[PDB]
């Protein structure tokens, strides 16, 4: 009856200064800021969840306007608890500075 | 042929050098032996502390 996903912001792509490598998102998971606090989140399912003009299908549901791009937090990115993700398609860039949901549900807990 | 890494893949190590089996049979047993003997020292030290 509430929220079963931890909040996270799409920081932007894995990139060098002047070559962005679009196939790898970086994820600022809310409340975690140490390459330490982040072994929880390794290998968790994650959703860029967004809605669009035309209708879609929906697993166990009637046709909707919301769509998602699924992905997976792979590894911890640099000291201050950023995390790398990788998504079944690359994230839009429209997406920068927006919510992506890091689930709990490939749990090892 | 795929190179399976001997150092991870026990049976590949054995294929290349069968004396590994024994060397590793020893050094499980050896380490267990000594681990037991450490507990036995620790129990005697606790008994000496109680006395």
């Amino acid at each position: 009856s509430g929220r079963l996903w931890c909040k996270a912001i799409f920081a932007g792509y894995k990139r060098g200064l002047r070559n962005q490598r679009e196939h790898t998102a970086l994820l600022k998971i809310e409340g975690v800021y140490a390459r330490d606090e982040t072994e929880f989140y390794l290998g968790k399912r994650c959703a860029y969840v967004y809605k669009a003009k035309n209708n879609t299908v929906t697993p166990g549901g009637k046709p909707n306007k919301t769509r998602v791009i699924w992905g997976k937090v792979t590894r911890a990115h640099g000291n201050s608890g950023m995390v790398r993700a990788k998504f079944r398609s690359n994230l839009p860039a429209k997406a920068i500075g927006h919510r992506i949901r890091v689930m709990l549900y490939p749990s090892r807990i | 042929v795929l190179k399976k890494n001997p150092l991870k893949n026990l049976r590949i190590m054995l294929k290349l050098n069968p004396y590994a089996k024994t060397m590793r049979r020893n050094t499980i047993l050896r380490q267990a032996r000594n681990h037991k003997l450490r507990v036995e020292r620790a129990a005697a030290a606790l008994a000496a502390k109680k006395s």
Partner: protein
């Protein structure tokens, strides 16, 4: 000198290099030492008939 790092390897170093990255030169084709049949075929005329002999 300023093109290399070098020095005196351990026993373990010689093992780890040979087992993890031991590749024969066998008819000028870099081939991985998957069996002693390879080492023997080439070095067996010296008494070297296995990975272990090679390491020694």
């Amino acid at each position: 000198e300023p093109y290399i790092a070098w020095g005196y390897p351990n026993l373990k170093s010689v093992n780890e290099l040979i087992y993890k990255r031991g590749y024969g030169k066998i008819n000028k084709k870099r081939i991985a030492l998957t069996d002693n049949a390879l080492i023997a075929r080439s070095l067996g005329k010296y008494g070297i008939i296995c990975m272990e002999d090679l390491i020694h």
